[PDB]
Design a binder for this molecule. Sequence first.
Ligand SMILES: CSc1ccccc1CCN1C[C@@H](C(N)=O)CC1=O
Ligand SMILES: [Zn+2]
Length: 140
Amino acid sequence: SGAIYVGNYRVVNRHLATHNDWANLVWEDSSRDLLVSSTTAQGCDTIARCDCQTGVYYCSSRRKHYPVSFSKPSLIFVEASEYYPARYQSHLMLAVGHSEPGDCGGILRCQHGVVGIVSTGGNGLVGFADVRDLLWLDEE
Ligand SMILES: CSc1ccccc1CCN1C[C@@H](C(N)=O)CC1=O
Ligand SMILES: [Zn+2]
């Protein structure tokens, strides 16, 4: 689990969104595994606006932050899971790293701020849903 809190927005994995998230919905995209809801309190995270390919992510199944090299956001085939059939997920970046299903939501960050959140994985790979192109998260 986990979320990004920027401005009056909460960014979560679409497959982990709560009823309160759906009842306060701003935007959702199943192909990206992302959902954004509105919040009453202002958050403290800043979004990275860059092309970094190295950063650090939080892995809840290890209680550790790991430095990683990750691919550019792309259209990647993701195996069937409890939440989606086997399909292509867009704006996904892959890295070598430990992940388990409940690791979704962990933040990947670089020197500029938050880059995205854990969304996929298995067999020593971890995939992150990018948020750097969502410029509207910085305003309103
Ligand atoms: C850290 S994810 C992971 C790790 C180990 C094994 C399996 C997984 C993938 C689990 N997933 C991927 C999500 C998606 N974005 O399609 C939906 C879901 O249930
Ligand atoms: Zn950066």
